[PDB]
Amino acid sequence: GTMTLKEFIKSLRVGDAKKFAARLGVSPSYLSQMASGRTAISPTRALMIESATEGQVSRAELRPHDWELIWPEYA
């Protein structure tokens, strides 16, 4: 990918980021905790974020320490 989840959210307008949290089925607080590394991004939600950002925030940035194991085919 090109950027981290935190970097991508930083770039959205506040209104857009509230809509992005809504689209992901999470609260803006939970999205923030995900972007700040305070809680895990589930494998499915990583796929959701990857597809929503057209690959800009990829599963490798969202599960940096075990993406090679969860998706051996992606590598």
Resolution, Å (one decimal):
1.6
Positions of E strands within the chain: none
Sign of the torsion formed by the C-alpha atoms of 48, 23, 62 and 8 = positive
Tokens representing 17 are: 């980021």
Q: How far apart are CA 66 and CA 10, in angstroms?
A: 25
Roughly what angle, to the nearest 10 degrees, separates helices 28-35 and 14-23? Answer: 90
**Buried-exposed string 49-62: b where 16+ CB fall within 10 A, e elsewhere:** bbeebeebbbbebb
Say which CATH architecture domain 5-70 belongs to: Orthogonal Bundle (1.10)
Token pair 């800009």 is found at 56
Which residue from 54, 48, 52 is spatially nearest to 63, judged by alpha carbons? 48
Domain residue extents for the chain:
5-70
To which H or E segment does residue 4 belong? Answer: none
Count CA within 13 A, CB hemisphere, residue 4: 12
Which residue from 5, 69, 70, 71 is spatially nearest to 37, judged by alpha carbons? 5
* CB of 49 closer than 8 Å to CB of 24: yes
